[PDB]
Amino acid sequence: VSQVRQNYHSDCEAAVNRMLNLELYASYTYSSMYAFFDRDDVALHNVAEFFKEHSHEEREHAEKFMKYQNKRGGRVVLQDIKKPERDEWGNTLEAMQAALQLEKTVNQALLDLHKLATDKVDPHLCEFLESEYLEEQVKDIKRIGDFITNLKRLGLPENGMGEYLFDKHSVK
Amino acid sequence: VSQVRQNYHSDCEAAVNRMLNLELYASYTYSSMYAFFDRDDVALHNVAEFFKEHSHEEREHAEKFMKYQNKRGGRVVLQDIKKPERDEWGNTLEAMQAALQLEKTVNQALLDLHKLATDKVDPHLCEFLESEYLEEQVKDIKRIGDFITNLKRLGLPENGMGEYLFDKHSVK
Amino acid sequence: VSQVRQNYHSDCEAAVNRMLNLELYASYTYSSMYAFFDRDDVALHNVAEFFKEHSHEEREHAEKFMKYQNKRGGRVVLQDIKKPERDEWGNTLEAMQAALQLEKTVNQALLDLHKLATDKVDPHLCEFLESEYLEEQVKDIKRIGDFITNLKRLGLPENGMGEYLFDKHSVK
Amino acid sequence: VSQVRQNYHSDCEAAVNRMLNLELYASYTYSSMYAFFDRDDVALHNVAEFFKEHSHEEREHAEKFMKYQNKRGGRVVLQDIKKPERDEWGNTLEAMQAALQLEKTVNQALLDLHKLATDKVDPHLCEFLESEYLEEQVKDIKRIGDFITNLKRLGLPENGMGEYLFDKHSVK
Ligand SMILES: [Cl-]
Ligand SMILES: [Cl-]
Ligand SMILES: [Cl-]
Ligand SMILES: [Cl-]
Ligand SMILES: [Cl-]
Ligand SMILES: [Cl-]
Ligand SMILES: [Cl-]
Ligand SMILES: [Cl-]
Ligand SMILES: [Cl-]
Ligand SMILES: [Cl-]
Ligand SMILES: [Cl-]
Ligand SMILES: [Cl-]
Ligand SMILES: [Cl-]
Ligand SMILES: [Cl-]
Ligand SMILES: [Cl-]
Ligand SMILES: [Cl-]
Ligand SMILES: [Cl-]
Ligand SMILES: [Cl-]
Ligand SMILES: [Cl-]
Ligand SMILES: [Cl-]
Ligand SMILES: [Cl-]
Ligand SMILES: [Cl-]
Ligand SMILES: [Cl-]
Ligand SMILES: [Cl-]
Ligand SMILES: [Cl-]
Ligand SMILES: [Cl-]
Ligand SMILES: [Cl-]
Ligand SMILES: [Cl-]
Ligand SMILES: [Cl-]
Ligand SMILES: [Cl-]
Ligand SMILES: [Co+2]
Ligand SMILES: [Co+2]
Ligand SMILES: [Co+2]
Ligand SMILES: [Co+2]
Ligand SMILES: [Co+2]
Ligand SMILES: [Co+2]
Ligand SMILES: [Co+2]
Ligand SMILES: [Co+2]
Ligand SMILES: [Co+2]
Ligand SMILES: [Co+2]
Ligand SMILES: [Co+2]
Ligand SMILES: [Co+2]
Ligand SMILES: [Co+2]
Ligand SMILES: [Co+2]
Ligand SMILES: [Co+2]
Ligand SMILES: [Co+2]
Ligand SMILES: [Co+2]
Ligand SMILES: [Co+2]
Ligand SMILES: [Co+2]
Ligand SMILES: [Co+2]
Ligand SMILES: [Co+2]
Ligand SMILES: [Co+2]
Ligand SMILES: [Co+2]
Ligand SMILES: [Co+2]
Ligand SMILES: [Co+2]
Ligand SMILES: [Co+2]
Ligand SMILES: [Co+2]
Ligand SMILES: [Co+2]
Ligand SMILES: [Co+2]
Ligand SMILES: [Co+2]
Ligand SMILES: [Co+2]
Ligand SMILES: [Co+2]
Ligand SMILES: [Mg+2]
Ligand SMILES: [Mg+2]
Ligand SMILES: [Mg+2]
Ligand SMILES: [Mg+2]
Ligand SMILES: [Mg+2]
Ligand SMILES: [Mg+2]
Ligand SMILES: [Mg+2]
Ligand SMILES: [Mg+2]
Ligand SMILES: [Mg+2]
């Protein structure tokens, strides 16, 4: 047992490793979206940059779980980072819809980790999630939802002029 | 009778209390519009902020009537602030149309208070209204009318692209 | 169901609307106290300004609940803002006593909302209350209690010199 | 007839001269109060300075009526400035009570001049009074009333400690 370990259940340690992997999976999905929107036959560079920034954010979320694991005396165990579910993302609306579902998947995993930490009576892990993860997820979900509403209003997927307008006034 | 009171008719004092309540009612209506445009399924944040600012302005108009009442030696009497007439505001045009009618309602109440002050021969109250309230009402009514004209030109309520364009170039 | 909604119980959504209304009710009560202390026959302007500031604070607390409701995908539903329980507040001690009970009423409502969020297993709402509301309530309750102790020590309600001294050295 | 004169009734011209004299009479009364509070056996120097400042203000009000008279083509006609009604002013409360009645006397004269200007249909004179005189009178009356309330609360005229406290915290 690590000399620093105190009130840290093996189940929580394992779930933190799984959460780290999911953050990395999300980062990789966002990077795929960045690459898609940078294609010469897609060419929506403000949209591409939005997804690149989200890729960076998710990787930082992962690094923070690595640091957390070590601080508590757990051991980081890495697994393969699976490739994204799609190779091409259609258009800005389709990609934002996919991002919304990904953010809700991540949020559900965070909520499930919080349930586990509650069951094992780990207030440090609970507060870490509450103060460092759950509010940013809710903010990101709201932002992406707002974008989806606007893209539908702009006539996506059919209205290419609307798609151009979005790239030029909403993510600039 | 208050030691400061001079040339202040009971009827005017009461009408000032009623005017205070109407300013508060208007502030609350605008706050409702702010909340509607901040919804994830509406998502027009520059429009929401316009209404939030107008909510603030109306509350300041109310505070100034409270201060006026005390300066003249009248007594502030508060009543319930009624909830807005609608829970949802449709779209930017529908909301601006509602705001125009609200501003005209407030302006009519100010004009009616001025008639009363004239009848009771209260030049201080008349000038307060003339110099602190009536010109801002006319300016606000003109601004909202100009917005309505533009929203109709942009094809509201049917044209969602027009609604997006307005939010991005007229209230930014 | 809103596209952003996740782990947000209808009961919590409704209780957030009720909490918003209570914050607005508190703001309105404080504004009444401001107006009372600004009267020419009361004339304690540092006390009036203290209550005006608290009125502002409470309105900001309400706006933050509106924003919260939308972020979670709930719908803001407004009700009448009831007028304050009194039209006149007696003196500085009587008003501070009323403010203490109002702040404890608000705090009890926050604690009850936290119980509901706990029962429905909503850690985001729990942390929002814990980190954005509960500590400010405890601080405000302590400040007002400290003022009450000082006002009693100064001989309120009978000792007018004490009341003047308080206005000039404790809320300046 | 003056070459500049237009829509200026002889009655209004005469009433402006009488108003000028009353402003000068008020200035002189305030100067008497300044001198009283500067006496070695009274010795309330912040109170004395308050009245000195009001003396200055009233003299400026008079000069502005002189300038007004000439601008309209009327002729300034001066009369004796009568000495104040009292040679000694008792104490801070007695003096503030006298100042309140003086300010209300001046305000009544301004309101009466406004009635005359209304009857003779002189909008320039009406607006001059409304915008340059009536609001300052209401503000001054409110301030002095607030002081009277505080002086009574402090136990004047009997409570000398209260009188000292006022001079040190309310007019400093
Ligand atoms: Cl352990
Ligand atoms: Cl274990
Ligand atoms: Cl972050
Ligand atoms: Cl696998
Ligand atoms: Cl694919
Ligand atoms: Cl997903
Ligand atoms: Cl966070
Ligand atoms: Cl009156
Ligand atoms: Cl009356
Ligand atoms: Cl304004
Ligand atoms: Cl009713
Ligand atoms: Cl409705
Ligand atoms: Cl209306
Ligand atoms: Cl003006
Ligand atoms: Cl105005
Ligand atoms: Cl839900
Ligand atoms: Cl539910
Ligand atoms: Cl706050
Ligand atoms: Cl009811
Ligand atoms: Cl009452
Ligand atoms: Cl209460
Ligand atoms: Cl807090
Ligand atoms: Cl003439
Ligand atoms: Cl004539
Ligand atoms: Cl002046
Ligand atoms: Cl004589
Ligand atoms: Cl005498
Ligand atoms: Cl007099
Ligand atoms: Cl003025
Ligand atoms: Cl002291
Ligand atoms: Co993200
Ligand atoms: Co993440
Ligand atoms: Co990093
Ligand atoms: Co595979
Ligand atoms: Co995310
Ligand atoms: Co936080
Ligand atoms: Co984010
Ligand atoms: Co407005
Ligand atoms: Co208004
Ligand atoms: Co204000
Ligand atoms: Co109703
Ligand atoms: Co308005
Ligand atoms: Co003007
Ligand atoms: Co305005
Ligand atoms: Co408060
Ligand atoms: Co509050
Ligand atoms: Co605010
Ligand atoms: Co009622
Ligand atoms: Co409070
Ligand atoms: Co907890
Ligand atoms: Co917490
Ligand atoms: Co904190
Ligand atoms: Co506070
Ligand atoms: Co004066
Ligand atoms: Co004067
Ligand atoms: Co001069
Ligand atoms: Co004589
Ligand atoms: Co005066
Ligand atoms: Co004017
Ligand atoms: Co003015
Ligand atoms: Co003055
Ligand atoms: Co002191
Ligand atoms: Mg283990
Ligand atoms: Mg936003
Ligand atoms: Mg009455
Ligand atoms: Mg304009
Ligand atoms: Mg429900
Ligand atoms: Mg628990
Ligand atoms: Mg303290
Ligand atoms: Mg003549
Ligand atoms: Mg004052």
From Swiss-Prot, chains A, B, C, D:
Keyword Cytoplasm: no
Annotated signal sequence range: none
GO cellular component term, pick one: cytoplasm
Single GO MF descriptor: ferroxidase activity
Record-listed E.C. numbers: 1.16.3.1
A Pfam family of this chain: Ferritin
Reactions accelerated catalytically: 4 Fe(2+) + O2 + 4 H(+) = 4 Fe(3+) + 2 H2O
Cited PROSITE patterns: FERRITIN_1, FERRITIN_2, FERRITIN_LIKE
Residues binding Fe cation 1: E23, E58, H61
GO biological process, one term: iron ion transport
Function as written in the Swiss-Prot or TrEMBL entry: Stores iron in a soluble, non-toxic, readily available form. Important for iron homeostasis. Has ferroxidase activity. Iron is taken up in the ferrous form and deposited as ferric hydroxides after oxidation.
Additional remark text: There are three types of ferritin subunits in amphibia: L, M and H chains. M and H chains are fast mineralizing; the L chain is very slow mineralizing.
Family classification: Belongs to the ferritin family.
Subunit comment: Oligomer of 24 subunits. The functional molecule is roughly spherical and contains a central cavity into which the polymeric mineral iron core is deposited.
Entry protein name: Ferritin, middle subunit
Organism: Aquarana catesbeiana (American bullfrog)
